[PDB]
């Protein structure tokens, strides 16, 4: 028995989370998997349960604001004695150091020290720990996730307070590594095109009718006393069209819709009239220009000098020109798609001396622009970035695509498409 | 059908404790029971894996 | 009524086994195995035996459930008679487990009525001299994943406890639990000679009838709590006795693929908590339509519902992504090879007929989700390291694939082209592109 | 020392000492030796000379475990207490870090605790300065050799000092150890004594059993018929059939020659008759008895026989479906190591190459959806991650790590013929 | 890595915090408790010196870690991207989900020694 909440599209999943969670510890299963990709509101639908259940007690941890397991143990032990202070303030406490723990023994060593002074409680109370984002921990491995499963059983089972877990993770290839533990899973499905728009309208009406960019445009135009419902319609006409002209570009996201709205909204506001408030279809026909462009990209003619420009134009030549062909076709007498090959030194100046307008011999400034180009990360080393100077075995390679080469060819009037021949 | 026949060998191994290679008086207690000369012939070779 | 809800209180804790230890119910297909465990464990404490054993069986096989059941079965009558020390191989490394033992020792002494103090090898010879040496306290060892202690390099901790069998006046017993089957070859020579060689394999559900007999003993309540109980008990078996009943039909599926009881035991827990009155619950086990919805949700986003939940473009990129992948020998393909053949695919659609061909600068935003939907992989990318120090050796390593740009990381394929034809319906326009 | 006072408790409620309980008390591995009788002297006469002459020598013994070299050298020093020395058991494997033995030695001369650096300074300061007696056992020498041999050079360089009051006794795993791990410069210091210990022989393996069975073989117990308690209402006897003890000896001397293995197979076979005796009468836990030959027949086999064959036929259907597909690729290609996607490619194909048999159709319905014609059209089979995880942690299979779930290779770990053979059932 | 980019940076502000203040852990724990650990609030600035040499997925995973600090309201974040050149190269390398995080209030101020001479 529990007081379930109600939400928009989790009607099955609210039932199971009301099923798999009770305030009684015996009915409560130990470990749990909430799985789904980002863009399902699992952090939404979990907390939305918890606000409707003030009877239980939740301790909220956040792995994504941590970096490793060694603070993650320090994250747990600092918080439970922080929470149990605010739940039973009459109970005296030998407060321990949460900085002291760094190893997975030390947690259950300290939880053996924490819970024993809390033994005098009246009934078996549970205590739900919540980890949010267990796959995106940036030092994860295989033998961390099971390491947190068996933590319950190393605890004494007869204590008045029982710690149980709920794990939030993503990337369901990861969950397939641990199906043999058979812990109860509640998968969260992705969304469909209507329920994306249905979620988005009931979540963004509260800001886009109350933004001052509307409220300025209210008093700036001749304001007819349009209702909030009249503000609701144009907001709804905005949302029901923006998901229609962009759904193929964004997929079934919610986060990627929550910001593209907040980029194209004031540019939509300026192109309204006093009269198009009653005229929605012609309003889209006047504000058309934003609905067919992305506007997420905030093609350079590159800063580098002339001899460095020809230094780049010789380096792109060994993306296709092998040593078997080059010395014949460049006498002094297609892999456009493919990944670039590997240079060595002085093959550059082999090609550089050929393609330059006897007119040049001094190569001090030519050697200057090489490590200038190395700091630009346009030509990088194959090996580590340390010993590449003294000629040991060091291979070089470009990192510029074909188009920026093509503009920079014509920027110095040099022709390159002749020498690329499939 | 072969668990018993090790113990009549153990009755011989009770008597003298001899691991002989070829038999004339081990086989004499087998023919009165009901099994042929071929079954025991396999029992010689397979109990060699028992190093007995 | 609360009496229906009181029946929910009884049935749920029966499905978790959290009853008092007198009424914990062991299934029939393993009652022999607990008794030989019992004959091992109770003569170790009472008759002061000093013998070890290794439990071996697959995951979720009641192994840790069996052992503490014996302890609770002995906690009722042999209270002070013994102490338990439980070690996981997962939570303990080779060297902190010494501190794991000694710290768990001293907290038993206050429960039975200066040890952890010192260096790690200082406390090590302490528990050596405290163990090797009216009646004597016996000590039960509980080892989970003892195979990870059985590594190649040192194997120290196994060697000390197994010699405590041989010399100590303190009566001990060791309980290895694992799942690596041939555990005995994993040990070296000098440790195996210390070992008393007795292992016991854990049983499995060998016949279809066995788990049918198990689930009957699982769900049936025998104690009188609710007025509903006598009505509830005969509804259970009537579904179970009929071989054409749906509950009996769906248990047969669990016998086929999983053949493991806690998988099916997992399914019933929402099915018996989702009911609100008595009669709805009886129809639920009569219909078992909730098991369909349950197996729907467990399936809904592994691979197929990943594919069904994508837009028109995301299909069209991936469909092109496999038609490039079929051409090369390794199957690898770059981003430029994808967008090039994606171009002529859209051009074929207009020339055979009005479809917005997108740019270059936007497909990247769609390409980002496709790699983190795991429909592609990087070419040589070991995904997850096994332990911590192998992962830490991969963190310091600066990489070369990031040093080539985004559009040339050689992405390979997770879902092959020929399998796309079977899932993509023919009503979609790109169905001619699934086949080559 | 201290806490053994606290390891004692009071209430001991009359444990039933049955017939076979008093066997296992003496069949405990604790309590002159018949087999290594003269070699005890060869140690001792090598040791008695240096002890009563204040010198520094080295003694090197080798052999497989289970031959008494842990035991015999303890019997050397034990009588010597009757007739100037400090006994230490410097075990190799009981050191956490290899340098930690250095701490013990400096602890066991005066009672001080410093680091392994500061110990060996004062140890070296001891071993060349003291005017004029230390016995040290360097057990299990495979542990302390591993890193860079700088530890092992010290333990024999101390022997070279003529003013060093120390007697070292090395016990190794193999005679080869100063020839395949150590340098020759250590091999000069090891000497050429090299006392070899062989195995035990099966005649002496009879002669080691009855030393535990001295006062109890064919003796008499005083027994009440109500509780099964035996006292060294009937007055029963219990006999041990020596031929079954002999066939225990002729195997263990054949394979290993291990003194623990001989005692424990008798100890395992003893408790088989214990439960069968308790089965027939049920005295619980609160005319002439014997132990048959049929007990040691089972228990010796119980060291051998497996279950992975019985495990495989008691697995799931899709488990046995998996391996049958896997051997099909190994006889198709002959490459013993197949890509994971090709197996998923095969189990699809192994559906429809069989006919429209409704058993296969009732399989093929269930193999891609758990009934429920609503949700269907699964690509890979139901619980395919599960059985492959279940075959992985079982040790039968082995799968290399790759984030690609198609081209990650799979290698068998048990013999594929027995996989072929168990599949036939 | 992601790890030491966090850990050295938390160290570098912490000594700068005690020197103006007149045991703790070097991660984001200090960031929320900075109101209680040091009284006044926090406005940090990030002088990314040479931004195009860094593996950008480390930088992309770094900025998501800073995104979690946006729920405490007593701290203000400011990023300074000292590129060498080639702004179009930079929007190619990062994840596009983070460019939309970046594109809220961007300012493309030019700083060049040679600007119209
Ligand atoms: N049923 C719903 N009703 C209203 N809003 C919803 C509903 N489902 C999802 N949302 C919204 O979706 C947003 C997504 O929140 P998140 O929980 O972060 O998404 P996510 O899938 O959990 O990604 P994360 O944070 O990486 S786990 C929430 O902030 C809600 O505003
Ligand atoms: N506290 C508990 N009380 C009763 N049953 C439990 C408890 N914890 C786990 N179980 C049961 O244990 C079973 C799972 O088997 P376990 O032995 O715990 O795991 P295992 O894989 O068999 O061995 P482990 O735990 O992996 S080392 C399930 O049926 C659980 O219901
Ligand atoms: N000749 C013997 N007489 C009596 N008891 C013996 C004899 N040989 C071995 N034992 C017993 O069997 C045990 C076997 O231990 P040992 O053989 O001494 O050890 P081991 O040969 O060094 O093997 P290790 O220690 O693993 S290298 C001894 O501890 C004794 O209890």
Numbering used by the authors:
A (entry chain E): 2 to 299, 319 to 353, 372 to 395, 412 to 476
B (entry chain 7): 740 to 791
C (entry chain D): 46 to 158, 171 to 190, 207 to 426, 447 to 529
D (entry chain A): 404 to 434, 448 to 499, 507 to 555, 560 to 659, 677 to 730, 769 to 907
E (entry chain C): 138 to 159, 180 to 274
Paper text:
Helicase loading at DNA replication origins depends on the Origin Recognition Complex (ORC), Cdc6, and Cdt1 (3–7). Orc1-5 and Cdc6 belong to the AAA+ family of ATPases, while Orc6 shares homology with the transcription factor II B (TFIIB). Here we employed a previously reported Mcm6 mutant, which is missing the C-terminal WHD (amino acids 839 to 1017) and is referred to as McmΔC6 or “mutant Mcm2-7”. Here, we report two cryo-electron microscopy (cryo-EM) structures that capture helicase loader–helicase complexes just prior to DNA insertion.
Three-dimensional classification of the OCCM–ΔC6 dataset enabled us to identify a 4.3-Å average resolution structure of the semi-attached OCCM. In this complex, ORC and Cdc6 form a six-membered elongated ring with Cdc6 bridging the gap between Orc1 and Orc2. The ring is characterized by interdigitated domain-swapping interactions between the WHDs and the AAA+ domains of adjacent subunits to form a two-tiered ring. In the semi-attached OCCM, we observed the entire C-terminal domain of Orc6, which was making contacts with the origin DNA. The ATPase subcomplex Orc1–Orc4–Orc5 in the semi-attached OCCM is largely unchanged when compared to the yeast ORC–DNA structure, except for the Orc2 WHD that is rotated and moved out to accommodate Cdc6. Therefore, the Orc2 WHD appears to serve as a flexible gate that allows DNA and Cdc6 insertion. In the semi-attached OCCM complex, DNA near the narrow C-terminal tier of the helicase loader is in a bent conformation, and is held in place by Orc6. Moreover, in the semi-attached OCCM, the Orc4 insertion helix (IH) is seen binding the DNA major groove, but not the basic patch of Orc1 that interacts with the ARS consensus sequence (ACS). The Orc4 insertion loop, the sole connection between ORC–Cdc6 and Cdt1 as observed in the WT OCCM, was invisible in the semi-attached OCCM. In this structure, the Mcm3 WHD binds to the interface of the Orc2 WHD and Cdc6 AAA+ domain, and the Mcm7 WHD binds to the interface of the Cdc6 WHD and the Orc1 AAA+ domain.
